[PDB]
Subunit: 155 residues, 5 copies
């Protein structure tokens, strides 16, 4: 054997094919399929509907699924609605509503702008929804999918 393989083997820890049966799943407590395990429930759902304020979705470590819509405005509009992740020093917008660019009119129709995110927060991070104006709203739901170590949280 001459190989990267020794390297992966190193980090992580023949000519007869061996027939095996994998019992990880049952030893793990049974199978939990991704779509079911990520299900929203009444108790686990972080519902939000933010207009003219800043509202925390999550501020403790872990992985979060967050889906929803923002009120679209002209890209030059003064009315903003976003999902952003921040630590108070650096802030990054993960979903932006000022995206549309009408031509030849000041009558500007608006549509929802969908977002569907998986965000991982570590210590000191905050995932928040923000709207700076009563006319625009960040609406959606979120839930914790897993703890910061990656251990899955049952729905």
């Amino acid at each position: 054997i001459d190989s990267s393989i020794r390297d992966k083997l190193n980090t992580l820890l023949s000519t007869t094919i061996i027939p095996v049966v994998d019992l990880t799943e049952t030893a793990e407590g049974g199978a939990q399929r991704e779509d079911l395990q990520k299900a929203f429930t009444l108790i686990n759902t972080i519902d939000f509907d933010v207009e003219n304020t800043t509202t925390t979705i999550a501020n403790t470590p872990g992985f979060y699924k967050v889906v929803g819509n923002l009120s679209s405005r002209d890209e030059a509009s003064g009315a903003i609605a976003v999902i952003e992740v921040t630590d108070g020093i650096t802030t990054k917008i993960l979903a932006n509503n000022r995206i549309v660019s009408p031509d030849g009119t000041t009558a500007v129709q608006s549509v929802p702008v969908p977002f569907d995110l998986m965000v991982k927060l570590v210590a000191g991070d905050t995932l928040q929804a923000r709207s700076n104006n009563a006319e625009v709203r960040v609406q959606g739901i979120a839930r914790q999918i897993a703890d910061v170590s990656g251990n899955l949280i049952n729905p």
Copy 2:
């Protein structure tokens, strides 16, 4: 860091080739299919309609009638237990500017919702002008056992 102790109440430097016989000893997309019999179809106008109120996982997909965020017309998917209600899909999202002629679009939702004892998944419209439309089916029981289409 031995998870070997939990599942099963040194390391070799020789890689052994294997073949897995587990499967031999249902695909997700097929398992979750809609049929005439399992489909919970709904088209909700000026009323509140229960999609499901018995424990289990449900898949629910469809559209709401968009309205101005300032509108009084409500069309939503929501989960309640009669004490706490949380909205899972909201129609009052649009923000037109420089006009009172407010075009509307469908607002799509595609959700997996688990209900436990006493939970209700429901579609609600408070006005004849806005709709909650879509379909649902039960994907699994409350214990996570899959249901065949």
Copy 3:
């Protein structure tokens, strides 16, 4: 490099339907795919071809997409209309007695105007038909369309169908 007793009835039952455990972790490389002649991957299995594609563009009639047992993928668009319109464009499943709408076009709720813009209403479904079932596309009016494509993905039994 010696073993250890284990106490599980969940593992034990599962091994009968399909004790102790060694303390030397073996590196392996799975050869099951090659051994089988290559494995199928979902996204390729479900591919559309010129032969298998059921294309439809439906206007002011009712058109069968499929009416024989099996699992069907069906994707496309409907012409959106005001929720109050009489103009209907839908994907439905029926058995001649009960009919259920799987995609619905009468959804928009314009306000303060009667000039009603329209957009495509996307659908993307997996539908299993059993004996007697029909999947159809229906437009009741020349102004509205049901457009899209579909193909049989697997038989009523579940056996995947090569593209």
Copy 4:
């Protein structure tokens, strides 16, 4: 060790390993398969677009071949939506020169009480397999409507994957 009684398993093993006992000692393994093959081992990485593999297209008032050799293709993008009554056509189609099937159609909107007809993108996202003589194409019959997108070959006609 013990003996197994199952014909299905003996048959699976017969075909998988061409030319029966069980064990009661669970062996903890680690899997190095993805590393021994190396890179783009997960579906999403293997299907990546690159500057070299990307078939970019932006079609206006002409027919443009996206692919015409056997293989599985991923093709994603948008059409200019027009009124369902329009004569302006922007589609993705597949053909053998005899039969032609549209896989993404742009003539879908149904405005009411106006002739000022707003237009939006109509997204498509397809997996298409072509055999000998099949052509995958984008077609616009008018300079006012576009078929835009990207495609790439995901696999040869036999299902063997192509690295990005």
Copy 5:
């Protein structure tokens, strides 16, 4: 007991630079635990404050990434008429060949010059090799390219953990 096996031979030589067993071995797999956990696609691909390449491009060309590896990039462009002079798009380039991967000039209004605009979404997995650049570009103050990206894997295909 052993038995001789006579594709698999080619695979073994390729994979690890011939016989079978009759005793079926029960086993547990700890690779994900050994890899450090959260290797499930959705978790591993998560955006974080540190890894997120956020961009909001207007009237300028902005690099999203220009070093080898696989990137996920998602976002929106400001739609314009297909004949519009205002472009915002996401494209990969080598400084010789450039290809647009998301294009905003898609709408075709009829019977009006009052042209409404919507977000044009993109969701891409892009692999850059040496000399490749992925960038967002807008030629006009009126149109944006917005969204986020991160590196999912190195060019060799090793996953990067969030």
